[PDB]
Chains A and B, each alone.
Chain A
Amino acid sequence: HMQLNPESADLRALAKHLYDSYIKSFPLTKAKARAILTGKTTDKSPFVIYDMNSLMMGEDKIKFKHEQSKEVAIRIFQGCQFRSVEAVQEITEYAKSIPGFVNLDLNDQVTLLKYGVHEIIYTMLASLMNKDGVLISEGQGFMTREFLKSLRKPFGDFMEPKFEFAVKFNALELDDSDLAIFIAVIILSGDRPGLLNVKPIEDIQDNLLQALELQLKLNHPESSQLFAKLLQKMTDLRQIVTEHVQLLQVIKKTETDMSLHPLLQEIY
């Protein structure tokens, strides 16, 4: 017996607040990405990189956000890192809007974002993916999954776990209103190492969990246990992350150091 009572309306207001803030913080939404990927937008059709000849044309004529490395695999990887550094800033801006978050101890805010940004990056990356590939340069290009897989070792396997995650995750058909609450749940995780004060984090999480549950009930009439399934994904996501980390160390051991993002070069 669900009712539309004061408590439920406050959880809906919380969900809308998050949605609005998510729209502000993340320019390329899932709705806008799906419209591009399904050819149901009036916006500019992206350039497709599906082989090396199209990569060269893409970098040349179109100019993609990726002394540059002479090798394609390294330019791609470095581009992904750079974009992820920008993603940290977007995610931090979003975290400031979660009610209660900025009233936490600053060191705990930091620690929550430090351990949560990689999970949120991979969650939101799925929005830009379909079975064929991923949107790049804010939707101006599209790079195929099979092209990414064809990069020389160790870069050929770099995106594959993200695509594998995405196929299954996208099958749940979450929308941006669902995702805004989900990513707030991930940020307010009380089990991150090195947290000072866990209960206030858990109290914010509990309210966000309530809001997610209700959002999912109202928005997904045909998946009665979607809440549980999403919590299971958060359990998963930690593995894309645990395995990115292993991959990175192989990369940093065996490849030339690549350029630092300007923001870091500036920080030191």
Chain B
Amino acid sequence: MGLEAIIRKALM
């Protein structure tokens, strides 16, 4: 959830 938002931002 947060884990996923952390990752999406990092990939962007």
Q: Measuring CB to CB, which residues of chain A are less than 8 angstroms from any residue of chain B?
A: 85, 88-89, 92-93, 95-96, 102, 106, 109-110, 113-114, 117, 263-264, 267-268
Give 1 or 0 for each of B1-12: 1 = CB within 8 Å of chain A CB: 011111111110
Distance in Å: Cβ of B9 to nearest Cβ of chain A? 8
Which chain A residue shows the least CB distance to B3? A114
Residue contact A263 to B4, C-beta cutoff 8 Å: no
With contact pairs A264-B2, A267-B2 given, residues A88 and B7 touching in the complex (Cβ less than 8 Å): yes
With contact pairs A89-B10, A96-B11, A109-B11 given, residues A114 and B4 touching in the complex (Cβ less than 8 Å): yes
Residue contact A85 to B6, C-beta cutoff 8 Å: yes
Which chain A residue shows the least CB distance to B7? A113
Chain A residues whose CB sits within 8 angstroms of the CB of B5 once the complex forms: 264, 267
Residue contact A263 to B11, C-beta cutoff 8 Å: no
Residue contact B11 to A114, C-beta cutoff 8 Å: no
Chain B residues whose CB sits within 8 angstroms of the CB of A263 once the complex forms: 6
Distance in Å: Cβ of B5 to nearest Cβ of chain A? 5
Which chain B residue shows the least CB distance to A111? B4
Which chain B residue shows the least CB distance to A110? B7
Cα A93 to Cα B2 in complex, Å, equals 17
Residue contact A89 to B6, C-beta cutoff 8 Å: yes
Distance in Å: Cβ of B12 to nearest Cβ of chain A? 10
Chain B residues whose CB sits within 8 angstroms of the CB of A264 once the complex forms: 2, 5-6
Cα A85 to Cα B5 in complex, Å, equals 11
Which chain B residue shows the least CB distance to A85? B6
Distance in Å: Cβ of B10 to nearest Cβ of chain A? 4
Given contacts A85-B6, A88-B3, A264-B6, 13 further A-B contacts (CB under 8 A): A88-B7, A88-B10, A89-B10, A92-B7, A102-B11, A109-B11, A110-B7, A117-B3, A117-B7, A263-B6, A264-B5, A267-B5, A267-B6
Which chain A residue shows the least CB distance to B9? A267
Cα A88 to Cα B2 in complex, Å, equals 11
Distance in Å: Cβ of B2 to nearest Cβ of chain A? 5
